[PDB]
Amino acid sequence: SVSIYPSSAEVLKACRNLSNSSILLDKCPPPRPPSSPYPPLPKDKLNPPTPSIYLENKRDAFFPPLHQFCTNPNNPVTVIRGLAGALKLDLGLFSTKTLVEANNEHMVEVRTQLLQPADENWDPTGTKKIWHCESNRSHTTIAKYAQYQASSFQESLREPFKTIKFGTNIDLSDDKKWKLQLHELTKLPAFVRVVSAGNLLSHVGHTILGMNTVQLYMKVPGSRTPGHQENNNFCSVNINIGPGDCEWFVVPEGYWGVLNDFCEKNNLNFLMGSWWPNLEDLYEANVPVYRFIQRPGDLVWINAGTVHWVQAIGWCNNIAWNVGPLTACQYKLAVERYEWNKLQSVKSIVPMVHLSWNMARNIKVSDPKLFEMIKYCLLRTLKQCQTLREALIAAGKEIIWHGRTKEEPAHYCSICEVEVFDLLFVTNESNSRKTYIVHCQDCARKTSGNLENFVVLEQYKMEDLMQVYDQFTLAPP
Ligand SMILES: O=C(O)c1ccc(O)c2ncccc12
Ligand SMILES: [Mn+2]
Ligand SMILES: [Zn+2]
């Protein structure tokens, strides 16, 4: 166990001395979208079968190799067949009828869409296949969406596209409204649980809605979730409640640069836009597509960075959340997309700096590659904080001890939405109002070169950070 990182004292001494030798190369290669993977795949390998686990007994679910099979980078997606039945999960707790009985006034975000044929997406005139996926936002209650979902089923029983409505992003975070639902999910094995010691998102220290909390989706046939990677490339878990089936389309992480280019050529934003890929385009470009059906009770594991899009075939509900395996692969993909998001001016829903410092306090990391990635992160941010701190003092500006409360979330810049760690810039008016509306350093200087209109709040004792950094060391196996 040879340590390759400077001590916190050494970092601090190097930040004071403004001649000397360097600690590290501050410059760093900026992120970019990858080129199409090498080696390329021939046409006969562009429709690969889906990695599948066939569960029969509760015991099968707790088999340790299941974990490694799902996180294997070579498996972009895994369908765990018969999960609900092997664990005797009561999916009825998530039926529309049960949900209405429990919280009939609960909010539902509604996406109004066009009912498209099979795997295709046509412009609204039925004239040509396009990538843009019309999906307009409104809001309703569980009671009113339940009513639509049920009558929709009745019209079909009886006997230029039809408009449909998709009930999405239903917040199941409140354990006093959903106690029975959330308790049922504690029956799952650790590696897919919402909360776990082995789940990086359980170390964020606060709620990230829909990632470390459960979301529900209420669907009618044709309800589409457009193409996306998960927030900061975290893995995802999804269970179909039924009674109908869902159809999944999946592209390996390695190809997201190719899909980003398809989005740009089609005048769409990869990260933030609404797009449904044309499968003939993907085929022509040698992009492999995993396509499969998720039945009621089947669990779908979306591996880190997997590009995917989904549509209901029948009437069904789904539940979903994110997990973060404690692996070098997952941490690396999360930090890369954290960096890419900054370049793109897209908010990182997972505050990777805040989270890395929490990981360093709480987790004994025994894998060298993961450990080095985390400590490198601590080093870069520790150095950034002490460098900023020095420049402020040397400029006469004062640093107000602000501290932070139990579970205080990470703060972001109200202008560019970057994470702002440790040193917060707020205007004097937002200071007194205790709206504490945070800016990053760059956005503050844009409105006040000398920071006259700004106070600087400090969240952590530098000595606290220096100690967490020095006590984060490679754990024994
Ligand atoms: O509609 C779904 O079942 C779904 C499946 C997989 C996902 O990653 C989602 N992300 C956001 C909203 C819905 C979904
Ligand atoms: Mn998703
Ligand atoms: Zn900013």
Non-local (6+) Cβ contacts of 57 within 8 A are 86
Classify domain 395-461 at the CATH class level.
mainly beta
The two beta strands, 454-458 and 399-401, are parallel
H or E element in which residue 424 lies: strand 423-427
Specify whether the CB–CB gap between 408 and 207 falls below 8 A. no
Å from CA of 443 to ligand 3 middle: 4
User: Is the distance from the beta carbon of residue 320 to the nearest atom of ligand 1 less than 6 Å?
Assistant: yes
3-state secondary structure of 290: strand
Closest CA to 317 of 193, 182, 179, 166: 166
Specify the DSSP class assigned to residue 362: H
Specify whether the CB–CB gap between 104 and 142 falls below 8 A. yes
d(CA 258, CA 325): 26
Residue nearest to atom 9 of ligand 1 (CA): 225
Å from CA of 227 to ligand 1 middle: 10
Q: What dihedral do alpha carbons 170, 176, 181, 182 form, nearest 10°? A: 90
Specify whether the CB–CB gap between 449 and 422 falls below 8 A. no
345: left (phi over 0), alpha (psi -120 to 50) or beta: left
Which tokens is 30 given?
A: 């900026």
d(CA 382, CA 88): 48
Closest CA to 119 of 52, 178, 47: 47
Å from CA of 237 to ligand 1 middle: 9
Which residues are 412's β-sheet partners? 419
User: Is the distance from the beta carbon of residue 217 to the nearest atom of ligand 1 less than 6 Å?
Assistant: yes
User: Is the distance from the beta carbon of residue 306 to the nearest atom of ligand 1 less than 6 Å?
Assistant: no
* Closest ligand relative to 238 C-alpha: 1
Residue ranges for the known binding site for Zn(2+) are 413, 416, 440, 443
3-state secondary structure of 187: helix
User: Is the distance from the beta carbon of residue 236 to the nearest atom of ligand 1 less than 6 Å?
Assistant: yes
State residue 346 phi and psi, 5-degree precision. Answer: -115, 135
H or E element in which residue 250 lies: strand 246-251
Residue nearest to atom 3 of ligand 1 (CA): 318
Non-local (6+) Cβ contacts of 378 within 8 A are 356, 357, 360, 468, 469, 472
- Exposure pattern of 92-124 as b/e (b: 16+ CB <10 Å)? ebbbbebbbeebeebebbbbebbebeebebeee
Closest CA to 33 of 271, 287, 227: 271
3-state secondary structure of 186: helix
User: Is the distance from the beta carbon of residue 425 to the nearest atom of ligand 1 less than 6 Å?
Assistant: no
State residue 172 phi and psi, 5-degree precision. Answer: -105, 35
List the chain domain ranges.
1-16+328-394+462-477, 17-327, 395-461
| Three-class DSSP labels, 307-319 | EEEEEECCCEEEE
Q: At how many Å resolution was this determined?
A: 2.0
| Closest atom of ligand 1 to CA, residue 219 | 1
Cis status of the peptide bond prior to 48, with omega within 30 of 0: no
d(CA 361, CA 341): 26
H or E element in which residue 139 lies: strand 135-141
Residue ranges for the known binding site are 228, 230, 308, 413, 416, 440, 443
User: Is the distance from the beta carbon of residue 229 to the nearest atom of ligand 1 less than 6 Å?
Assistant: no
Specify whether the CB–CB gap between 412 and 438 falls below 8 A. yes
| Closest atom of ligand 1 to CA, residue 225 | 1
What is the per-residue DSSP string for 58-104? HHHHT-THHHHHHH-TT-SEEEEETHHHHHT--GGGGSHHHHHHHHT
| Closest atom of ligand 1 to CA, residue 236 | 8
d(CA 12, CA 42): 54
| Closest atom of ligand 1 to CA, residue 169 | 12
CA-derived radius of gyration, the chain: 24
User: Is the distance from the beta carbon of residue 223 to the nearest atom of ligand 1 less than 6 Å?
Assistant: no
H or E element in which residue 28 lies: none
d(CA 469, CA 325): 22
Sign of dihedral through CA atoms 209, 169, 211, 95? positive
Which tokens is 232 given?
A: 């900061």
Å from CA of 454 to ligand 2 middle: 38
Å from CA of 320 to ligand 2 middle: 8
Å from CA of 441 to ligand 2 middle: 32
Specify the DSSP class assigned to residue 399: E
Alpha-carbon distances, residue 398 vs 279, 386, 431, 455, 456 (angstroms) = 58, 14, 14, 8, 7
Specify whether the CB–CB gap between 342 and 363 falls below 8 A. no
Residue nearest to atom 1 of ligand 1 (CA): 225
What is the amino acid identity at position 456? V
The CATH number of 1-16+328-394+462-477 is which of 3.90.550.10, 3.40.50.880, 1.10.10.10, 1.20.58.1370? 1.20.58.1370
Domain 17-327 annotated CATH 2.60.120.650:
yes
Å from CA of 228 to ligand 2 middle: 7
Residue nearest to atom 12 of ligand 1 (CA): 225
User: Is the distance from the beta carbon of residue 108 to the nearest atom of ligand 1 less than 6 Å?
Assistant: no
Task: Match 């209420």 to its residue by tokens.
Answer: 218
State residue 427 phi and psi, 5-degree precision. Answer: -70, 160
Specify whether the CB–CB gap between 112 and 224 falls below 8 A. no
Residue nearest to atom 10 of ligand 1 (CA): 225
Specify the DSSP class assigned to residue 272: T
Closest CA to 33 of 276, 345, 264: 264
Method underlying the structure:
X-ray
Ligand 1 pocket test, pick from 109, 113, 238 with the greatest ligand atom count within 8 Å of Cβ, gives: 238
Å from CA of 287 to ligand 3 middle: 37
